[PDB]
Design a protein around this nucleic acid. Structure first.
Ligand SMILES: [Mg+2]
Ligand SMILES: [Mg+2]
Ligand SMILES: [Mg+2]
Ligand SMILES: [Mg+2]
Ligand SMILES: [Mg+2]
Ligand SMILES: [Mg+2]
Lengths: 305, 38, 67, 132, 107, 122, 192, 101
RNA sequence: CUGGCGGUGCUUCAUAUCCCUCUAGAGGAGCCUGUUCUGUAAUCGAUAAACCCCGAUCAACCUCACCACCUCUUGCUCAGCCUAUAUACCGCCAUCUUCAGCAAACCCUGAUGAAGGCUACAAAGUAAGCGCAAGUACCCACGUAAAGACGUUAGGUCAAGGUGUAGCCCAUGAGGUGGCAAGAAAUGGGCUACAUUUUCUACCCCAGAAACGAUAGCCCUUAUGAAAUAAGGGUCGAAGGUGGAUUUAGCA
């Protein structure tokens, strides 16, 4: 235990010297100085994130353990000292006493989290018994003080994934309600300019979509979003496609058009499109060619057989 | 060429400011074999 | 990179101007064309000097039309 | 398995250093680079001669001190500066230390046409990684 | 050559092989060295400069060989363990007592 | 300064194109940060970004004696920082490069400065 | 006694008087007990003073921000003015069309001989010149891989001599001779 | 003063090909050619056919120093992959690591 | 005494890993390529399990590291050995792993013996140290290069390279000079066709031959050399009509 204090004092002297280095007047600096140091005079470069130079006051990094467990002629800090982990059992006894008191009157954390909170290494069945006792307490006459005391060991709900980042209609640049977007499909990117009016054709890369992709699958993919939203003809575009080749560019244009549509579309249809699958990028992307194999995942023939 | 370099290493060893582990070990093994030889 | 790697001087008119310094054999075969090609290759190589190129041309002309 | 530079568990208080305990797939992850030389660079060329010179210097410096170099050096080329960071151990007296250091410095500076200098590792604790 | 050579770990683990010297000559001394004023002198405060010779170096090498022979002789440190009960068997013999525990009572 | 004050005309420098080359990411980051700090202290408007990386993964086996069904490579997470100074004088850039090289990062983080003169035609 | 300038060093001392020279880490002259190393299981990094990793770092402990500011104040000299000829890569070329490259790469190892300072290109913007009456039909053919459309980039890679400044001088002389010869075009240069 | 022998063979062959510079230079420059006369070409052919071994400029095989291995060698480091891998395993090379992509 | 075993009955169960299902290269065959081994003055590495496009990111004297003639016990080495002991090593690494734990130091269970430490309405584990877990970076966190513990084949190697010990010390080293490249026989790892898919052509998809595959080898050669290897021009222009229960990766 003395080594902990020795290292703490050594690092305190080191931090004093570090503060004395700078000739400025702010002694209670924040993480800015540590960041500047790691950027200038401590660039390790190790890929890992633990062995990197993260020098910090060990007053909070060095963990703590049970201090003294006895005083004048033994005398621990509780009557459940010989039971191992006296704190947990004392808390359980207090919970049982509160249970009996309430009876007379009338999300959860993980094991590691409870261990870090306390100073005991509890198992799983003891945690289950503690949860059972807490549930019995919450059920025994629903109040307020006890409910808050029990929730202290719990967290809020914090619901996510609900609304969609509605993009503005964008009326600047020109006198047309256009909207930027993008699309990805096996390493590819684009930037479309889907207007709001213009019930006619579409200019794909400055040229009509007749001499660009005579295949019907390309036109079907291009219609995918407009057909899903039912706003077919009433749309003009002057996108600039790049990267990919055929199906990649088709999917990129499809995603760009879907995003441009969702930009200025009712929340209902926006959510329907987002849930149908035509906004994000599927995981089907140019993977890493396996060096220990002939092709992609195709391993050698008589490997295990 | 390792000729001038070998001579420099030999001179350094003679001066007592170098170490030749593999060469000395091979020389000792050769001496032992000659004693057992031939 | 100035402390060395000078390769002597050229005076911006010594390495390329090789038309006169040629010693043209009686113009009747590809020997003159080959010598011109060699001079072009030497001029396109910035790793040579005036004396080196002169000696190379002299040795080439000798080994070719010694007779 | 792979024992490129690691040492599996055995006892508890055995001798072992940082370089004497690492995996091949952790050359740049949990382990650093003991030679930040101007050789294996990109797109810059010149690597063979640089590596040869680095190996020669490392072997010479290891042969200098007798029985005091556990790990290799960490050469540093700041243009025309050869900085050595040897893991030296307190051998005997400081007079011999200074004499040998000055002799080697002068010799290398007059030979390689570049200033050379080293510094001992006066630390009462090695860079032990795994307790083993 | 030397580039193709290696350090000492491989040679040691090959000569030993358990699975299935740096002490004699000092750096100050050499096979053909001379008296270096840098070391082998007092605190140097005023010093004397001199040089050795081939005969002196040969004498020093002979002395070092004699010291190595003496060390090799000392290496044969054999002791006859008191035969307990029977020979080549851990019979009746005392080693050491048990050290005190975390509480006390010197046993 | 202490560089023999002269009165002859100087050469018209323009664009000090630089390109750092290395392997380690933290070292390149530190080098580019120090360079940007020194440039800002000197007072030169510049831009910084990240050009495409250049990695030529050479070929090699995973073992030493005999092994093909299990292969490995030795790549690198190299980066590049084009710390180009747009329009400036030659003497200041030379002094800056001198101060840089007086203590440059060993091995990795190697700069490839490049200027662009002008002078008069004929 | 006499610790490694860690405890005996006076507190709040002039640090610029500690690392003024561009020195390395110096594990014995480092009053910063920085912890470096990967943990074992559930504890603290390894040693305290000089670590192998600390040395493996490119080493920038020398010259602290205070020393950096000192070096900057020292370098404050050399304040040569620069002309504001408008960027955009237009007026700069209009003023002087030629664009020579005189770089100074950094060498490696103990050898300064770096075969890389001989790069030179006479990238002269012909469009900026615009004084070719009949030489328009002559220059277009007297050079092969040049003469663009938007901006005439006459970049005749003249790297024949073993240097840079004399290479540029010879290139300028050849360009002047070519212009003087084109001033009086030939007789059969019209029909192409 | 090498330890192995293949290293010495390579050294001797390379130095013999480098020393006799003018001879092999002219030979390789004049032999296989469809232009110019054939007299000098035949002269060079006879010269290269009559001369003994340890001179022909076709004696270049990449090998290392630590092992003198011809299989799998690169001119960038003048050593083989095994030597390169052995040096990388000890963390003695910058930028080298596992294919993390 | 606790283990290997359970074609022991059974419990958790195997997600492409297994049968029921298939997507598909290869099986009958053209080309690059070697395996059991033949041959002299042209070794090859367990050349089964982990070799047969492995070392070879490749065999004209270098590369072949293998032998003889001019000479040696200074042989370029103040000699080395690519010579050997896998029953002695350093060295890299798959395998089981697509698991699940090993134990120092303690304290207990057998009238203390080979052993074990065993289940929350709790019947002895804290467990130094090595671990999945934390991913180490990325296409985020699945998935990729590689495991993932004490270990599994006196594991491959005395020769990828060095090495205890023995032998050469008229060599199995060699200073200078001369020597292969073909499958007697079978086979498989990669590019290819049996069909309009072999040719994609001015258009990558608005217009179609031989009615077959329409090879290799050889000559002119990009390169050079004392013997061709990837392939461009000419000739041959073949081998057999998915051919054996099928084989291996795949839950995008
Ligand atoms: Mg074997
Ligand atoms: Mg494995
Ligand atoms: Mg993991
Ligand atoms: Mg992997
Ligand atoms: Mg074995
Ligand atoms: Mg022989």
């Amino acid at each position: 235990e003395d080594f902990i204090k020795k290292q703490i004092e050594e690092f305190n002297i080191g931090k004093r010297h570090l503060a004395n280095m700078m000739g400025e007047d702010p002694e209670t600096f924040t993480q800015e100085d540590i960041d500047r140091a790691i950027a200038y005079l401590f660039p390790s470069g190790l890929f890992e994130k633990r062995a990197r130079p993260v020098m910090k006051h060990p007053e909070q990094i060095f963990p703590r353990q049970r201090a003294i467990q006895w005083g004048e002629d033994g005398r621990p800090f509780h009557y459940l000292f010989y039971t191992g982990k006296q704190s947990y059992y004392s808390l359980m006894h207090d919970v049982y006493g509160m249970l009996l008191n309430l009876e007379k009157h009338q999300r959860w954390l993980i094991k590691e989290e409870l261990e870090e909170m306390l100073v005991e290494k509890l198992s799983d069945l003891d945690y289950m018994q503690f949860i059972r006792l807490l549930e019995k307490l919450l059920t025994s006459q629903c109040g307020a003080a006890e409910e808050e005391f029990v929730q202290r060991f719990r967290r809020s709900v914090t619901l996510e994934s609900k609304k969609q980042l509605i993009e503005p209609v964008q009326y600047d640049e020109q006198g047309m309600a256009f909207s930027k977007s993008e699309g990805k499909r096996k390493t590819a990117k684009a930037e479309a300019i889907v207007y709001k009016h213009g019930s006619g054709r579409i200019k794909v890369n400055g040229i009509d979509y007749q001499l660009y992709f005579p295949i019907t699958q390309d036109r079907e993919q291009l219609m995918f979003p407009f057909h899903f939203v039912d706003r077919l003809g009433k749309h003009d575009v002057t996108c600039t496609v790049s990267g990919g080749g055929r199906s990649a560019q088709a999917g990129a244009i499809r995603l760009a058009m879907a995003k441009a549509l969702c930009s200025f579309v009712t929340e209902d249809e926006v959510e329907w499109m987002r849930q149908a699958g035509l906004l994000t990028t599927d995981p089907r992307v140019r993977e890493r060619k396996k060096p220990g194999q002939e092709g992609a995942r195709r391993k050698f023939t008589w490997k295990k057989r | 060429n390792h000729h001038t370099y070998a001579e420099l290493m030999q001179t350094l060893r003679f001066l007592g400011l170098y170490r030749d582990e593999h060469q000395d070990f091979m020389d000792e093994q050769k001496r032992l074999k000659k004693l057992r030889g031939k | 990179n100035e402390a060395g790697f000078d390769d002597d001087g050229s005076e911006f008119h010594e390495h390329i101007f090789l038309e006169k310094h040629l010693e043209s054999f009686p113009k009747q075969g590809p020997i003159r064309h080959f010598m011109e090609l060699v001079t072009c290759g030497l001029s396109k190589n910035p790793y040579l000097s005036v004396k080196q190129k002169v000696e190379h041309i002299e040795w080439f002309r000798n080994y070719f039309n010694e007779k | 398995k792979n024992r490129a530079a690691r040492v599996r568990v055995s006892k508890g208080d055995k001798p072992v250093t940082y370089e004497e305990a690492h995996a091949p797939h952790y050359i740049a992850h949990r382990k650093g680079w003991l030679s930040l030389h101007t050789g294996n660079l990109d797109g810059e060329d010149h690597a063979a001669e640089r590596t040869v010179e680095d190996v020669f210097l490392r072997k010479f410096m290891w042969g200098t001190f007798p029985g005091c170099l556990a790990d290799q050096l960490v050469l540093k080329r700041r243009g025309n500066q050869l900085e050595i960071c040897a893991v030296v151990l307190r051998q005997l007296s400081p007079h011999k230390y200074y004499f040998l250091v000055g002799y080697s410095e002068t010799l290398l500076s007059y030979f390689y046409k570049c200033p050379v200098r080293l510094h001992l590792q006066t630390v009462p604790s090695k860079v032990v990684y795994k307790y083993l | 050559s030397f580039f193709t050579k290696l350090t000492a770990d491989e040679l040691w683990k090959g000569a030993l092989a358990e699975t299935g010297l740096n002490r004699g000559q000092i750096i100050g001394e050499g096979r053909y060295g001379f008296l270096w004023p840098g070391l082998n002198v007092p605190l140097m405060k005023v010093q004397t400069i001199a040089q050795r010779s081939k005969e002196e170096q040969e004498k020093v090498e002979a002395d070092m060989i004699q010291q190595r022979e003496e060390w090799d002789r000392k290496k044969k440190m054999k002791v006859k363990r008191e035969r307990g009960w029977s020979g080549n068997s851990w019979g009746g013999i005392s080693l050491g007592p048990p050290d005190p525990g975390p509480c006390g009572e010197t046993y | 300064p202490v560089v023999t004050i002269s009165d002859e005309p100087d050469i018209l420098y323009k664009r000090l194109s630089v390109l750092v080359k290395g392997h380690d990411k933290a070292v390149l980051d530190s080098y580019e940060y120090f360079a940007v700090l020194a440039a800002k202290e000197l007072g030169i408007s510049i831009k910084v970004h990240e050009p495409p990386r250049k990695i030529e993964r050479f070929t090699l086996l995973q073992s030493v004696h005999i092994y093909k069904k299990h292969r490995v490579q030795y790549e690198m997470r190299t980066l590049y920082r084009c710390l180009e100074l747009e329009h400036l004088t030659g003497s200041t850039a030379d002094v800056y490069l001198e101060y840089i090289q007086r203590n440059l990062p060993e091995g990795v983080a190697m700069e490839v400065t490049k200027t662009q003169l002008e002078q008069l035609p004929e | 006694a006499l610790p490694p300038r860690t405890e005996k060093m006076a507190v709040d001392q002039d640090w610029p008087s500690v690392y003024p020279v561009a020195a390395p880490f110096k594990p014995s002259a480092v009053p910063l007990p920085v912890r470096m190393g990967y943990p074992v299981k559930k504890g603290v990094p390894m040693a305290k003073e000089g670590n192998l990793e600390l040395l493996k770092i490119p080493n920038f402990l020398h010259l602290t921000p205070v020393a950096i500011k000192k070096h900057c104040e020292a370098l404050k000299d050399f304040c040569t003015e620069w002309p504001a000829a408008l960027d955009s890569d237009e007026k700069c070329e209009k003023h002087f069309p030629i664009e020579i490259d005189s770089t100074d790469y950094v060498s490696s190892g103990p050898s300064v001989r770096n075969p890389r300072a001989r790069v030179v290109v006479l990238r002269v913007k012909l469009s900026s010149l615009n004084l070719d009456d009949h030489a328009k039909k002559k220059l277009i053919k007297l050079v092969g891989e040049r003469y663009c459309k938007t901006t005439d980039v006459l970049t005749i890679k003249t790297d024949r001599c073993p240097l840079r400044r004399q290479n540029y001088d010879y290139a300028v002389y050849l360009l002047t001779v070519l212009y003087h010869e084109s001033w009086n075009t030939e007789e059969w240069e019209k029909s192409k | 003063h090498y330890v192995d022998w293949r290293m010495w063979r390579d050294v001797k062959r390379r130095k013999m090909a480098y020393e006799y510079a003018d001879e092999r230079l002219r030979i390789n420059s004049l032999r296989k050619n469809t232009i110019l006369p054939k007299i000098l070409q035949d002269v060079a052919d006879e010269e290269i056919a009559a001369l003994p071994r340890d001179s022909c400029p076709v004696r270049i095989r990449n090998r290392c120093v630590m092992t003198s291995r011809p299989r799998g060698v690169k001119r960038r480091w003048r050593l083989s992959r095994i030597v390169f891998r052995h040096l990388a395993d000890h963390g003695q090379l910058s930028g080298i690591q596992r294919a993390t992509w």
